[PDB]
Structure 1
Amino acid sequence: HPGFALTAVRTDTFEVDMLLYSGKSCTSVIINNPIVTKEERDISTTYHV
């Protein structure tokens, strides 16, 4: 035995589930209509919303 009494620390990660409670209309969300944007190339065209 050397002249030490070193202490160890280690952390664990758990896979766990959650349950979440809220009241009626805690936060109000305001949104606009989806907006379409376009990009063109010869092989394929693409869209973003």
Structure 2
Amino acid sequence: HPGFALTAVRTDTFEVDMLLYSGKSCTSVIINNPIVTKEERDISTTYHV
């Protein structure tokens, strides 16, 4: 046994399922129509909606 003593501090990660309760129309989201933009390459043209 040496002089000093040791204190180990370990962290621990658990996976867990949270539940959530909210009020009837608690917030208000506002959306619009989706917009397509076209990013062009030769063999494959991508579109970001």
Flag whether TM exceeds 0.5 (same fold).
yes
Question: Normalized per residue, which structure has more strand?
Answer: 1
CA RMSD of aligned residues (A): 1.0
TM-score normalised by length of structure 2: 0.86
Alpha-carbon deviations, 1:10-47, whole Å to 9, x = none? 00000111110000011100011000111233312221
Ranges in structure 2 where 5+ consecutive residues have no aligned partner: none
Tell me the matched-pair count: 49
What is the rounded CA distance, in whole Å, between the counterparts of 1:14 and 1:32 in structure 2? 39
Ranges in structure 1 where 5+ consecutive residues have no aligned partner: none
TM-score normalised by length of structure 1: 0.86
Of all paired residues, the percent bearing the same amino acid is 100
